[PDB]
Design a protein around this motif. Structure first.
Motif, PDB file in Angstrom:
ATOM      1  N   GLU A  29       0.841  -1.191   0.000  1.00 10.90           N
ATOM      2  CA  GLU A  29       0.000   0.000   0.000  1.00 10.90           C
ATOM      3  C   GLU A  29       0.877   1.241   0.000  1.00 10.90           C
ATOM      4  O   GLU A  29       1.609   1.491   0.963  1.00 10.90           O
ATOM      5  CB  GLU A  29      -0.935   0.023   1.203  1.00 10.90           C
ATOM      6  CG  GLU A  29      -2.190  -0.783   1.024  1.00 10.90           C
ATOM      7  CD  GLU A  29      -3.232  -0.472   2.077  1.00 10.90           C
ATOM      8  OE1 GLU A  29      -2.947   0.350   2.973  1.00 10.90           O
ATOM      9  OE2 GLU A  29      -4.333  -1.053   2.014  1.00 10.90           O
ATOM     10  N   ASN A  30       0.796   2.018  -1.073  1.00 10.38           N
ATOM     11  CA  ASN A  30       1.253   3.391  -1.003  1.00 10.38           C
ATOM     12  C   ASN A  30       0.316   4.174  -0.089  1.00 10.38           C
ATOM     13  O   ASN A  30      -0.732   3.682   0.337  1.00 10.38           O
ATOM     14  CB  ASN A  30       1.304   4.010  -2.396  1.00 10.38           C
ATOM     15  CG  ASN A  30       2.188   5.226  -2.452  1.00 10.38           C
ATOM     16  OD1 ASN A  30       1.774   6.321  -2.082  1.00 10.38           O
ATOM     17  ND2 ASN A  30       3.419   5.044  -2.912  1.00 10.38           N
ATOM     18  N   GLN A  31       0.704   5.409   0.219  1.00 15.31           N
ATOM     19  CA  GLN A  31      -0.052   6.186   1.193  1.00 15.31           C
ATOM     20  C   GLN A  31      -1.497   6.377   0.744  1.00 15.31           C
ATOM     21  O   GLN A  31      -1.774   7.060  -0.246  1.00 15.31           O
ATOM     22  CB  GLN A  31       0.638   7.527   1.460  1.00 15.31           C
ATOM     23  CG  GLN A  31       0.983   8.339   0.231  1.00 15.31           C
ATOM     24  CD  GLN A  31      -0.046   9.406  -0.058  1.00 15.31           C
ATOM     25  OE1 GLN A  31      -0.707   9.906   0.850  1.00 15.31           O
ATOM     26  NE2 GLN A  31      -0.192   9.761  -1.328  1.00 15.31           N
ATOM     27  N   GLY A  32      -2.421   5.735   1.456  1.00 16.12           N
ATOM     28  CA  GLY A  32      -3.839   5.852   1.196  1.00 16.12           C
ATOM     29  C   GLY A  32      -4.347   5.165  -0.051  1.00 16.12           C
ATOM     30  O   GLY A  32      -5.549   4.895  -0.134  1.00 16.12           O
ATOM     31  N   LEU A  33      -3.486   4.848  -1.010  1.00 16.61           N
ATOM     32  CA  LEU A  33      -3.942   4.266  -2.264  1.00 16.61           C
ATOM     33  C   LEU A  33      -3.234   2.944  -2.516  1.00 16.61           C
ATOM     34  O   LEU A  33      -2.003   2.905  -2.609  1.00 16.61           O
ATOM     35  CB  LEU A  33      -3.698   5.225  -3.427  1.00 16.61           C
ATOM     36  CG  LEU A  33      -4.498   6.527  -3.447  1.00 16.61           C
ATOM     37  CD1 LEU A  33      -4.529   7.101  -4.853  1.00 16.61           C
ATOM     38  CD2 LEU A  33      -5.911   6.301  -2.943  1.00 16.61           C
ATOM     39  N   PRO A  34      -3.971   1.847  -2.635  1.00 14.65           N
ATOM     40  CA  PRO A  34      -3.332   0.542  -2.788  1.00 14.65           C
ATOM     41  C   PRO A  34      -2.827   0.300  -4.197  1.00 14.65           C
ATOM     42  O   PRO A  34      -3.347   0.838  -5.175  1.00 14.65           O
ATOM     43  CB  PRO A  34      -4.457  -0.436  -2.439  1.00 14.65           C
ATOM     44  CG  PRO A  34      -5.684   0.284  -2.821  1.00 14.65           C
ATOM     45  CD  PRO A  34      -5.435   1.734  -2.535  1.00 14.65           C
TER      46      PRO A  34
END
Lengths: 267, 267, 267, 267, 267, 267, 267
Positions: free
Chosen positions: E253-258
């Motif tokens: 997972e990147n920050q907030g966006l998978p």
């Protein structure tokens, strides 16, 4: 009119379809024949009574011209079954074989197996009989079949004479001519059909209005879309109107202009 | 005209369809033959009487030119059944076998089984007979079949002569020519057909008006839509008019111009 | 209406399909007959009860005009199975063969194999019996089949009489006429169909809105594209409205104008 | 709903397809019957559990209204197999033939082959038995088949009663009406279908964007060309949103307006 | 998913196709059974391993969530063959017939042909045995077939339980919900398909450019004409990019966006 | 890829097509088996070598990664024939029947016909043997068939293991990833196809120019008319260019940008 | 290329078509076998020589690369006939049956009919031999068939090895690459086809001009009308040009640009 003929074909098919097994026995043959030939007749008579809206009209009113019409439209089914069962044989010979007098019948000349044979007499239709009785039983078989077929043909003749007399009397003792009676019949048929269809459409559009009032919109085909676009509706007629429509109508004449039905009398 | 021929084909089919079983017996053969060959004839005669609107016209009026026409249009069905039953055999030989004189018949030269054989004589059609009687019974069988077929052919001949005489007399003793009679027949047919169709349409549109008066609108096909768009209607004719239409019409001539029917006389 | 007839055809097919093997035995025949002829009847009765929304309407309300209607719509399936099983034979003769009195039956004159034969009596339907008992068992077979078929025909007659009485009573003891009852039936049918379809469409568009709110767009066919383009939606009705819709409705009349259903009463 | 019926037809076909061979033997019949009739039942039960997304919903949450629904949707497959196996016979008689008491059974009157025959008793279904035992074994065969079929019919009856009770209880002990429950079911179905399709399309367009980012261009059909032209996309929803979607939803009401699913609760 | 079922149908067909001949012999039956039932199983296992790109992904990286997935996708082919071979019989009875204890088996009561018959025991499946041994060998045949079928049914049951446990554990011990896992699967499929097609087209246009550079012109269909007209190309991506694409991807997972795949991680 | 499978089907058909007749004889069986099973294998191997352009590429250059590829693409035809011949039987039993030790084999207990029977042993496959030897030869027949089928299954297993090891090694010991290898394969295929077609068209237009130079005009279809209208031509490339195109290409990388073929290296 | 395969199929059909009757006789078998298997081979070889324009090219010139090509293109027909005749049997056994040594062969142990039987030996293929010789002749039949089939398989192997060596040598000892050789082959084919068609059209238009010069007008179809409208003509090329075209062309290179045929050298 052909519905009765289709029902008669179905009656013959069901006759040759369901079953039949003559219970060779001293005293049960009588009852079995009576029931197996009358109970289907009674059922067909009830069915004929049911699907004749005249009876519901009559009971809704609550007269001899009504009872004749209804019972004539009904009894065509039991009669064409009774006749087919008599002419068929193997249902009269099964019930009236015990009652044959063993003294009065000629064959290969022997008196009779005994004075004990009344349970041996009624066992003939089950084809179980010794060789001597084998050559003996053909006589009583043919005689009973003869009696059955004669009763059948006489029944057909009496039914025909009755129908002819009914027609010749209804035409002789009616206030109208006969061509106008044909017009009247056509009018009754057309009025019933149109009323049925209109009732259906009016009811459907009323239901559509009701549903739309609930959800906020109604989903319809193209056909029902047209049906609502053309014909509006706000509310049905009151109960007194329905009560005025139903009932039996005898031919009444307003001044110079005849009426042909109660809905017509609602002019 | 072909309806009678279709009915004759159906009569032959029903003859070969329903049943037949000669009840070899002393005195029942007579009755069984008479009934099984006359009762269907009587039924066909009644049926022919029923579907001939001339009789209803006549009784509505309440003459020898009417009775001839009606009975001729009717009796074509019983005659073509009587003839088919005679020519068929096995229905005359069944009824007139007991009455054969056992003294006057030649065969393999033996006198006869006994003076007790009158119940043995009438048992021949059931094919049950001893070997000597087997070779004996063919004689009486062929003789009775001979008598039956002869009566049949003579019946056909008499019917033909009667039809020819009827035609030659009706043309000789009629006020009109024959070509104009053909025109008259065509007119009767066309008038009846057109009147029937118009009556149906007028009645349907009247019923539609009545229903619309009740619900507020009538549901119809495209066809009935056109039928109401074109032809309006307000009310039927009075009963005296219907009474004037019905009845028997003998050829009446207004001054110089003939009338061909009562509806025409309504000019 | 034809759904019941299709179910009856399927019932007959399943009768001739699944199995039957009469367990010739002293005391198990009774139980096996009772179960193998009643348990499918009970199952058909339950099935008929289930698919009749009237029962769910009733229990949702939580009266004799309701129970009659529901049990009549239901019991048509078990009766047309009981009758087919009785008339068929080979299911009554299997259960009531032990109880035959070995003293009272006439045949090729011998008393009976012994006073030990009650397990020999009930073994007849399995066709396993010695030659003497072979010629003996036909009597009891035919007698039991006779009893079965008689009970069957009487059952059919009683069902017919009951249906006729039910109809003649419901029409006699109802506040409305019968034509308006036909209108009412058509209205119930149309309203139910339209409500079902509208509910489906409204629900689908609501779900589409919900999904679009999540992903940012909704994928649809052309049809659903039209369905969303035409009919908008924001939220369903509250629970009190649903509660007001459901329930049993007896015919209530507002002033001068009748109501035909609870949704109609929601005007 | 018809998927279960198709699975039942397939179950019957596989029953008549794979194999069966009763291992006539002292003590292995018991185990073989138990396994060969239960293991396929257990497999069908597992299969029914698997394809019911309710169980995955439940375990994702980690209640009696859930277990009833899931086990009811599942157990329809093992029951319609157990019943078909009992009614078939030749699987109960194979397992419970050793336990028959050789003292209590009547036949052609001989005591029994010996007191050594318990391995001779359980060898009957393999049809290998001497002539005396040949005429003897039919009794135990029919008796065991009787017991099997009786258990089968009673199982069907109990299942029917259980289904009826389940329905009548779920409708009686639920906060909503039943029509709104139908609306709710339609909504669940529509929402699931629309969500599936939208998820597929959104995912495909996201993948297309990803590929184009790599190669510099993406090759597509006309359909996917339209799919990218219409619906854009930049990034999916965060994991908390997915977590909020999943789960079991019991009917919750916002003020005056009901919610029908968790995705709906995401308004 | 149906590819495995098609492979299973083909496996059954090849089972009934190629050959089988039980080599009745003292000690070769063991080896022949083992090989003829395991070697095709091993081959199917290898085939399943080959066409599962997960293994090539893994070896390209050079973990328990990978091995489970690959071995599960593979072992479906050998298991559905082992089960079909056990349930079939005539392959277990061929290998474990020598090991039957000749002392413990009951039949037509004789001890056994000798103490020399261990090569006579293992000759039973070849059906060559004297009349006494003919009636004797059925016992051991049925017993071995019993053992085979029992092992088969237990194998099916264990496989079903294992699959159910695998599912219930993978859903319980995974960081995501299950709906998002479905989205992820759809994304993997769509991405793989689109990448394959784009790779093919890009490669074809590159080759076309290369050929044109040589001859001076390239001959193409209309389709490839469009393919070159729309999409240009100058050169592929460097090797580090290809190396970055390949590999196993666990959900990151990147920050907030998978991210859902390595190519996606290449954003 | 399916060309090899079509060739395998054709190989099986030709096996069942051409002939086979085991020459029962002392020492010729050995040679006949060896030849009739190896010579077609050698022919298929040569055919596989011929149609693999890699060998012509290699010899045109005049390395272990080339020989593996070519011999793998080739040996698929002889192996699928050797296996089909072993599993078939009746070709191993024909060659290794003389070498059976007549002392070590058990049957209907007789020692052996003599110590003269080594030409009697090898005559078994021709089925010509006396009654005693008739019941004797089945043993050696089944034993040799056993050995053949075992060798066949082991051959299949070894081939499968070898293929799996080859794959797992080629992927492990290659400089590229595997997805880029797929891209490379697609590029080789596309380039070869496009080059072939372009060569054909260029050559045809050159020939057309040459012919026109002779006659003064060239006759062509519409297609070739278009081919000359679009693409002109003046002269082919020099021989050094052709020489630069051909050859084996190992993956070479220009700075940052990879090359995939020698024609690509011609940039 | 498929023309040779069609010719081979036709060769096999003609083998099974025309006749064969082994003339059992002392010394004529030798000659008959030799002729009936070689004369069709010689005819096929001549046919292959005829339709190979290379030979006419060569003789028109009046070298080892030409003879190899022509004899290879030719000898494919006789070899595929010799092999089919050897493998068939019943043609080698017919010719080499007299030469069998009657001392060295084992059978039902008798020495041999006499020392007079060399005309009895060669009579075996005609199947006419006494019962003892009947069981005797199978040995020599199978032995000769063995020898025939072995020679056949060895012939196939040698032909395959020769083809492979020819290919591997022609590619190794040629000045060009192999891809350019493919281009050269395509060019030869295209040039020959185009030249043929152009020659035909030019000749037809010349003939049309000649005829018109005679009659004053020429009658033509629409096609030939177009052919004259487009392409004019005044006179053919001189004989030296035709002489320059024909001949064998070895690959010659003008400066930097290769020539591929003599007509090309005419630039």
């Amino acid at each position: 009119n052909g519905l009765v003929a289709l029902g008669t074909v179905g009656s013959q098919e069901l006759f040759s379809v369901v079953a039949f097994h003559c219970p060779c026995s001293p005293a049960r043959n009588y009852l079995y024949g009576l029931a197996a030939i009358g109970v289907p007749a009674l059922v067909l008579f009830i069915i004929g009574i049911i699907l004749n809206n005249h009876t519901w009209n009559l009971v809704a009113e609550c007269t001899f011209l009504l009872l004749s019409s209804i019972l004539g439209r009904a009894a065509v089914a039991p009669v064409t079954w009774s006749v087919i069962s008599l002419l068929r044989g193997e249902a009269y010979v099964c019930a009236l074989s015990e009652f044959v007098d063993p003294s009065s019948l000629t064959a290969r000349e022997e008196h009779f197996p005994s004075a004990h044979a009344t349970e041996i007499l009624a066992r003939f239709p089950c084809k179980e009989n010794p060789d001597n009785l084998s050559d003996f039983r053909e006589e009583v078989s043919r005689r009973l079949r003869y009696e059955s077929q004669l009763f059948g043909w006489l029944l057909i003749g009496v039914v025909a004479i009755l129908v002819f007399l009914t027609k010749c009397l209804k035409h002789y003792c009616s206030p109208l001519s006969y061509r106008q009676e044909a017009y009247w019949a056509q009018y009754r048929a057309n009025e019933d059909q149109l009323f049925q269809r209109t009732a259906e459409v009016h009811s459907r559009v009323l239901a559509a209005n009701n549903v739309r009032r609930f959800f906020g919109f109604v989903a319809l085909n193209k056909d029902d879309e047209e049906l609502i676009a053309n014909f509006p509706v706000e509310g049905t007629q009151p109960r007194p109107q329905w009560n005025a429509i139903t009932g039996v109508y005898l031919y009444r004449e307003n001044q110079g202009l005849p009426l042909y039905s109660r809905l017509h009398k609602w002019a």
